[PDB]
Amino acid sequence: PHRYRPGTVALREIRRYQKSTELLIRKLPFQRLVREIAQDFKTDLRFQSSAVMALQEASEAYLVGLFEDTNLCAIHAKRVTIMPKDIQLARRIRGERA
Amino acid sequence: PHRYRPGTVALREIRRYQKSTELLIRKLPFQRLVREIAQDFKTDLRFQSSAVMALQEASEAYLVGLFEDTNLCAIHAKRVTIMPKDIQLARRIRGERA
Amino acid sequence: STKTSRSAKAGVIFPVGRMLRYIKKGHPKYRIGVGAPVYMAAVLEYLTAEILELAVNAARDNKKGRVTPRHILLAVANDEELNQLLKGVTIASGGVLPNIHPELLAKK
Amino acid sequence: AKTRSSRAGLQFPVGRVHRLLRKGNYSERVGAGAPVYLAAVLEYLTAEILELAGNAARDNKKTRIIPRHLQLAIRNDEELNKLLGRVTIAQGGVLPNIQAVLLPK
Amino acid sequence: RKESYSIYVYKVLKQVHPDTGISSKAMGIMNSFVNDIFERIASEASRLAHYNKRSTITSREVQTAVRLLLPGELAKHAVSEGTKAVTKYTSSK
Amino acid sequence: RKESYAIYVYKVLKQVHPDTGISSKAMSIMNSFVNDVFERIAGEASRLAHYNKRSTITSREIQTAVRLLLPGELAKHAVSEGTKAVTKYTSAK
Amino acid sequence: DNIQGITKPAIRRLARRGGVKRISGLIYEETRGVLKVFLENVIRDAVTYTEHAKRKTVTAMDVVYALKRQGRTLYGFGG
Amino acid sequence: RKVLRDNIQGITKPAIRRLARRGGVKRISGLIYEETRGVLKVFLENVIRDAVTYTEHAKRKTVTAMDVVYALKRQGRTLYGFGG
DNA sequence: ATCAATATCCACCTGCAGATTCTACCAAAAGTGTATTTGGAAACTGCTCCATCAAAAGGCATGTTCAGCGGAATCCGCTGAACATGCCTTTTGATGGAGCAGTTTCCAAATACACTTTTGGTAGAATCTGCAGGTGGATATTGAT
DNA sequence: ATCAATATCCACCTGCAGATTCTACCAAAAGTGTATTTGGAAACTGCTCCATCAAAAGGCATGTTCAGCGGATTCCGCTGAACATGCCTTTTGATGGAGCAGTTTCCAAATACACTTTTGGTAGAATCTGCAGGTGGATATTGAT
Structure with missing residues (x-):
């Protein structure tokens, strides 16, 4: 039979998405998240089409960046598996640390 | 003969210097370094004492901050000895790396 | 009986006149030397050009043959001084530079 | 006369704060309330x-x-x-503050 | 003459605690503090007005600014005082 | 209405790449760019003027502003490009 | 159940674009947490602009401005 | 007029050591000292380059604490206790 | 486990640097009386946002198999911590010289209106194409053998 | 290395979603004349910044000695990646419907503006005291035995 060794498809996935630019979170779900959160601040709100796109674009770019720093923190620890504490350190050093 | 174990004095200092607030770098040596850099930038400059003082307050606070972030990085790699690569990770995640 | 665009006088393509209008709309009591909007019109055109x-x-x-956001992120993130000038900026659908840390590479 | 600060019942200087709002060309006009409010806030944060x-x-x-x-x-x-x-x-x-792992046994 | 908030900070200091004093170095910081926030708020307020094509900074802009700049709880009490003051002011004559 | 730098971005583009065009979104980014740098430069400028108790934003401020905001090499050419345009604007009838 | 809609497959896609090879199982919820705080902060300010403007519609700009002040300047939506 | 040179070496190991202790560091790699001078040197050239630009903009031959204060701010590092 | 070696906690002592009142000059707040105009208020239009509907193929959740990674544990080479010594250099503190930062006032070069004529920039409709997407065979990459 | 299962890159073609271009009001930039402000000029006052100097003790530099840290090597239990599987749901394209942005236009409350009067700060000086620096001794911590 056939089967790809652990981490090969991942490396391939990396090379892939790292070459493209389309969003990676599902639109509908995101839009639901936005409106959900937005509510707790102001009721009966109306988002423009663009204001949601912009919101998501920012978010994904944010996470994609955070994952880069997190990857550095894993590698720093002789690992290659990003664990939650890599995200903590990364954000701690960033000044976010929430 | 008496002699403390390695670290005992170090922790002593950490406590000591964290409780105080005086500048840790020698004043004169610092003033020169500042004038050196300033001169190798624009000649015939004068400095109000406070500017030099301002620069040192700023310079020392900055490094103390860097050392904390540097210290977290070493601990992350299960080490207690800060190393150049430690200062390097912290500066990159900070966005300093220029 | 003729009109002459300050931009033409400045030998620039960007809106010298519009710039002055803008510098004012955004900074009140400040008077604005005629040099100001020309100098800036020129600087922005330069960076734009760059x-x-x-x-491309x-x-x-x-x-x-068609420049798209991606081409801009690439052009910016690969250039040192621009990438510096644009830290803290996110280019909609610009992606990220293609980069994989060797520690993660297969082995070969 | 009575000082605008006194009128807003404040220690911080409302007129002064008002003046600076002007010198600083933050805008064209400054509502008679703005310097009172700001002055008020600054005084509060100060108190804290x-x-x-x-x-x-x-x-x-x-x-x-x-x-x-x-x-x-x-x-x-x-x-x-x-x-x-x-x-x-x-x-x-x-x-x-000393990191915990740096403390002895 | 160089003006500063010394006497004003001192007034507030004596209310929080009557028997406490403040070093000139500490009063310095206090000054820097007041000046910094003064800047942050006025600035944010400024932009706010321009985003909304307005030509006037009013107590209303100052408040949103205070909202955008300050941490939740500090913000709340901040906005009380603000209003409390503007309101009182608007009747003291 | 709704203005932009769209058309100028375009001229500049063609002026150096006749056989190349730019997409909608791509253009919006260039637009953002111009608006941002514009703002950063205008911000530093008025600020220099303020610190120096001046009431006029002039090419001198814009320049300093430019020096303070741009990386070395990039800054070099902008200072040139600027003074260049102001000189020709002054002489040129 | 919004904030689960942000699926593991997606998060993985993200991390991938971020050069990530392996992923703790706990990462998923964690990222999920981080993303929530992110939007809370930017939307709150965005809505605050929308509010101050006496509007019931959050505009692209509201977001742009909110982002700006958070240090995260964003391009392509000033239109 | 005595020429100034290699004054970074004035930022001595003992000093870089106290700073790190206040930063809460217990163990220091031997390569840290030089590494730190490098980082310090960049920080200073940056703050000073801006400060002096302010100085020169105001056609002045003296670098004032405000020049430094404004300089530290352009860099997002606000400093209290020197604001004129 | 007890004990010598030391750094630490700290109550008292008190002279003096730095903080706190004490008072009159002066920008600058604060009244008043015009003068000017924002921007909320009211009526209105249409650029968009929420939506009801309904397929379908694109992804998500599920679950099974195990590769190999993260993490614990043993270990020893040598890198840094502690430290005693030697003596240089920063520190301290008083002292003169002078460059230069800051105040003040005379002034022409320059920016700010107020207003009219001439486009440069934009909207949206008429014209146009770069390439996303589909097909297909060559070749590269991966992995068991 | 030798297949062999498969992903990947590149040749190739065409309808059209989206970029490019045409087109004709028109808001705003350019223009001439007039009114108001300013920031460089210049003589000039005086703060403070520079450079000394002399005494000397705090602090740096060098060397040594060895504790324990960092890292290398080994060992495996189990966490996650690869892959097949059954299917819930996001995606998609046009729709009438109203909330609701964004315009035009009138006007009363609020700002600006130019003096005059009154006074709340500030700089300097006389004056009150919190605490930094030293001396000492009981206590807590550390490290050897």
Whole structure:
């Protein structure tokens, strides 16, 4: 039979998405998240089409960046598996640390 | 003969210097370094004492901050000895790396 | 009986006149030397020029003749001084530079 | 006459704050309320830091607040720390704190 | 003459605690503090007005600014005082 | 209405890449760019003027502003490009 | 159940674009947490602009401005 | 007029050591000292380059604390206790 | 486990640097009386946002198999911590010289209106194409053998 | 290395979603004349910044000695990646419907503006005291035995 060794498809996935630019979170779900959160601040709100796109674009770019720093923190620890504490350190050093 | 174990004095200092607030770098040596850099930038400059003082307050606070972030990085790699690569990770995640 | 665009006088393509209007709309009691909007119109055109310069080259390398956001992120993130000037900026659908840490590479 | 500060029932200087709003060309006009409000806020935030610093001073058995006290006051209060996050206080020092793993056995 | 908030900070200091004093170095910080926030708020307020094509900074802009700049709880009490003051002011004559 | 730098971005583009065009979104980014740098430069400028108790933003401020905001090499050419345009604007009838 | 809609497959896609090879199982919820705080902060300010403007519609700009002040300047939506 | 040179070496190991202790560091790699001078040197050239630009903009031959204060701010590092 | 070696906690002592009142000059707040105009208020239009509907193929959740990674544990080479010594250099503090930062006032070069004529920039409709997407065979990459 | 299962890159073609271009009001930039402000000029006052100097003790530099840290090597239990599987749901394209942005236009409350009067700050000086620096001794911590 056939089967790809652990981490090969991942490396391939990396090379892939790292070459493209389309969003990676599902639109509908995101839009639901936005409106959900937005509510707790102001009721009966109306988002423009663009204001949601912009919101998501920012978010994904944010996470994609955070994952880069997190990857550095894993590698720093002789690992290659990003664990939650890599995200903590990364954000701690960033000044976010929430 | 008496002699403390390695670290005992170090922790002593950490406590000591964290409780105080005086500048840790020698004043004169610092003033020169500042004038050196300033001169190798624009000649015939004068400095109000406070500017030099301002620069040192700023310079020392900055490094103390860097050392904390540097210290977290070493601990992350299960080490207690800060190393150049430690200062390097912290500066990159900070966005300093220029 | 003729009119002459300050931009033409400045030998620039950007809106010298519009710039002055803008510098004022955004900074009240400040009077504005006629030099101001010309100097800036020129500086922005320059940086604009500089970005397009490399965006294209990037579009070219991508076997394409149409500059798109990607081509701009590439042109910016690969250039030291621009990438510096644009830290803290996110280019909609610009992607990220292709980069994989060797520690993660297969082995070969 | 009566001072606008007195009228708004404030210690901070409303007129002064008003004047600066102008010198600073933040805009064209300045509502008669703006400098009162701002003045009010600045005085409030001032009171807050002063409150915690005073305590900090007395905690250290001291009658006079110094920079290290503003430092301790500020760095121990979640919110003030956030507001003054990119700030550095000359002669303030730092919160004493040793990483746990660095302590002996 | 160089003006500063010394006497004003001192007034507030004496209310929070009557028997406490403040070093000139500490008063310095206090000054820097007041000036910094004064800047942050006025600035944010400024932009706010321009985003909304307005030509006037009013107590209303100042408030939103205070909202955008300050940490939740500090913000709340901040906005009380603000209003409390503007309101009182608007009747003291 | 709704203005932009769209058309100028375009001229500049063609002026150096006749055989190349730019997409909608791509253009919006260039637009953002111009608006941002513009703002950063205008911000530093008025600020220099303020610190120096001046009431006029002039090419001198814009320049300093430019020096303070741009990386070395990039800054070099902008200073040139600027003074260049102001000189020709002054002489040129 | 919004904030689960942000699926593991997606998060993985993200991390991938971020050069990530392996992923703790706990990462998923963690990222999920981080993303929530992110939007809370930017939307809150965005809505605050929308509010101050006496509007019931959050505009692209509201977001742009909110982002700006958070240090995260964003391009392509000033239109 | 005595020429100034290699004054970075004035930022001595003992000093870089106290700073790190206040930063809460217990163990220091031997390569840290030089590494730190490098970092310090960049920080200073940056703050000073801006400060002096302010100085020169105001056609002045003296670098004032405000020049430094404004300089530290352009860099997002606000400093209290020197604001004129 | 007890004990010598030391750093630490700290109550008292008190002279003096730095903080706190004590008072009159002066920008600058604060009244008043015009003068000017924002921007909320009211009526209105249409650029968009929420939506009801309904397929379908694109992804998500599920679950099974195990590769190999993260993490614990043993270990020893040598890098840094502690430290005693030697003596240089920063520190301290008083002292003169002078460059230069800051105040003040005379002034022409320059920016700010107020207003009219001439486009440069934009909207949206008429014209146009770069390439996304589909097909297909060559070749590269991966992995068991 | 030798297949062999498969992903990947590149040749190739065409309808059209989206970029490019045409087109004709028109808001705003350019223009001439007039009114108001300013920031460089210049003589000039005086703060403070520079450079000394002399005494000397705090602090740096060098060397040594060895504790324990960092890292290398080994060992395996189990956490996650690869892959097949059954299917819930996001995606998609046009729709009438109203909330609701964004315009035009009138006007009363609020700002600006130019003096005059009154006074709340500030700089300097006389004056009150918090605490930094030293001396000492009981206590807590550390490290050897």
